[PDB]
């Protein structure tokens, strides 16, 4: 009406420019207040003619329009005001952590990771033994996640841990996490009292209780060590899970001293111990794979 422009160069960057048969008009859009030729950054919420936002929502100005931004969990539909909508369904309204579950509440969306995890909705640092069955809390990169220990375990091939290996000196302060024994390091944790000065350590440690059945879950079990003329003077707790393929994974934890080391039983994947001498008669007995 008063802002007929000779050229598009007369429209300020806060106004849109329309070429209608090379006739230029500068009409600033809602969110800018003026006569059209020149408009300033001012919310359309207080123009002549006013604004039409919902009372609960707060009238705000956006780059290109003024807008009515409801409290979160609700979005504006023109003509209806704040309409109920699950913002957790829209990836432009909810930016939850990938493991966290968005829940819709009045006035916000809230990212809630499932029950059992310890976090503020963004970083749920779980604790080992809190996960559902088949999974346990392990680190991945820089965060804690629940994963199957049968694929996240480490492996050890320390032949020094065999119960007859008395020579040497060790300290298991470096063992933490899930581990597996392979090769000459044995098939499974030792299940019996091991004499002192064996397993290349000063005081040997052994599992008290037997390994569980295949595909049994994580069960806490006890563990003992032998020193002086007494065996299992001190008692600890460890966890063992059985895995597909016929192997076990173990929660190895540092000991209270620096002369304690876990022993392992020989793998004995042979019915006859032909790795022993033919002059050292193999004793093929149930539960006692040995030669004498």
């Amino acid at each position: 009406d008063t802002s007929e422009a000779r050229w598009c160069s007369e429209c300020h960057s806060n106004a849109t420019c329309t070429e209608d048969e090379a006739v230029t008009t500068c009409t600033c859009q809602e969110g800018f207040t003026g006569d059209g030729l020149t408009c300033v950054d001012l919310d359309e919420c207080a123009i002549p003619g006013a604004h039409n936002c919902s009372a609960n929502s707060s009238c705000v100005n956006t780059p290109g329009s003024f807008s009515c931004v409801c409290p979160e969990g609700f979005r504006l539909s023109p003509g209806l005001g704040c309409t109920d909508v699950d913002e957790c369904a829209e990836p432009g309204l909810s930016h939850c952590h990938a493991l966290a579950t968005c829940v819709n509440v009045v006035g916000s969306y809230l990212c809630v990771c499932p029950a059992g995890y310890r976090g503020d909705g963004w970083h749920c640092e779980c604790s080992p033994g809190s996960c559902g069955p088949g999974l346990d809390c392990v680190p991945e990169g820089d965060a804690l996640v629940c994963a199957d220990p049968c694929q996240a375990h480490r492996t050890l091939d320390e032949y020094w841990r065999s119960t007859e290996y008395g020579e040497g000196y060790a300290c298991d302060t470096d063992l933490r996490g899930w581990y597996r024994f392979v090769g000459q390091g044995g098939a499974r944790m030792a299940e019996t009292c091991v004499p002192v000065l064996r397993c290349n350590t000063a005081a040997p440690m052994w599992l008290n209780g037997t390994h569980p059945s295949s595909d049994e879950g994580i069960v806490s079990r006890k563990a003992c060590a032998h020193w002086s003329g007494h065996c299992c003077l001190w008692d600890a707790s460890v966890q063992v899970k059985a895995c597909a393929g016929g192997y076990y994974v173990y929660n190895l934890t540092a000991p209270p001293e620096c002369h304690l080391a876990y022993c392992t039983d020989p793998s004995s994947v042979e019915g006859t111990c032909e790795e022993c001498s033919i002059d050292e008669d193999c004793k093929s007995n149930n539960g006692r794979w040995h030669c004498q």
Binding site: G116, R118, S130, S237
Partner: protein, 159 residues
């Protein structure tokens, strides 16, 4: 670690808040201690006492409701008396058993001079306690908020 009230209200692993309903004297004179033995109302336990050793403190105790405006007193924590509202963190309490153990807290609240009438109304919040837990294992710092409400009215006679 998990805690529960005498009335059964519990807070899971992770922290949170719970409502603790307590009985109070229906009348207390000026100069006499109102005694709120909260050791019978709040119980906690150790979930894995074989290794981790947990330490529990009262980080802040503050008066609310009728106690904040018509009473003054002290809080007896672990046998020792401290000002109420609290101005310092209380010593650590060791919890080393799966068997639930009392939280050793008792309030000794003496009314101030009053024109008379009901000073504490039923259903009003009389105290808020922030339980702080630490250990010697890692950076566990969980907050257990205890909202203390009066079951009955407390008359303070003129005096």
């Amino acid at each position: 670690f998990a805690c529960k009230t005498a009335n059964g209200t519990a807070i899971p692993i992770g922290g949170g808040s719970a409502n603790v309903y307590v009985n109070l004297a229906p009348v207390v004179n000026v100069g006499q201690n109102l005694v709120v033995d909260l050791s019978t109302q709040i119980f906690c336990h150790n979930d894995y006492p074989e290794t981790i050793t947990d330490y529990v403190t009262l980080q802040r105790g503050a008066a609310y409701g009728g106690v904040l405006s018509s009473f003054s007193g002290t809080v007896k924590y672990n046998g020792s008396s401290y000002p109420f509202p609290t101005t310092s963190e209380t010593p650590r309490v060791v919890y080393n058993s799966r068997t639930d153990k009392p939280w050793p807290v008792a309030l000794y609240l003496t009314p101030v001079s009053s024109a008379g009438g009901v000073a504490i109304k039923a259903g009003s919040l009389i105290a808020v306690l922030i339980l702080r837990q630490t250990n010697n294992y890692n950076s566990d710092d969980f907050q257990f908020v205890w909202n203390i409400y009066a079951n009955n009215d407390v008359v303070v006679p003129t005096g």
